[PDB]
Amino acid sequence: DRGLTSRDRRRIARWEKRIAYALKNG
RNA sequence: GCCCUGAAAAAGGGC
């Protein structure tokens, strides 16, 4: 079993999926 | 329960 859920792993991914937006949008 | 897509602090979708 894993202590992280579909939200954990994806939670950090946003770190690279959000920057592009929050960064490309100024 | 696990993800994927959404930027999402929506909305969605697959199994």
Through-space distance between the first and last CA atoms of chain A, rounded to whole angstroms:
40
- CB-contacted nucleotides of strand B (7 Å): 1-9
Q: How was this structure determined?
A: NMR
Closest CA to the C1' of B8: that residue is A18
Cα gap A1→A4, rounded to integer Å? 9
* A21 CA vs B8 C1’ separation (Å): 10
* A10 CA vs B13 C1’ separation (Å): 16
Q: Measure Cα distances from A2 to A6, A10, A16, A20 in Å.
A: 10, 14, 22, 29
* A26 CA vs B4 C1’ separation (Å): 27
User: How many Cα neighbours within 13 Å face the side chain of A18?
Assistant: 6
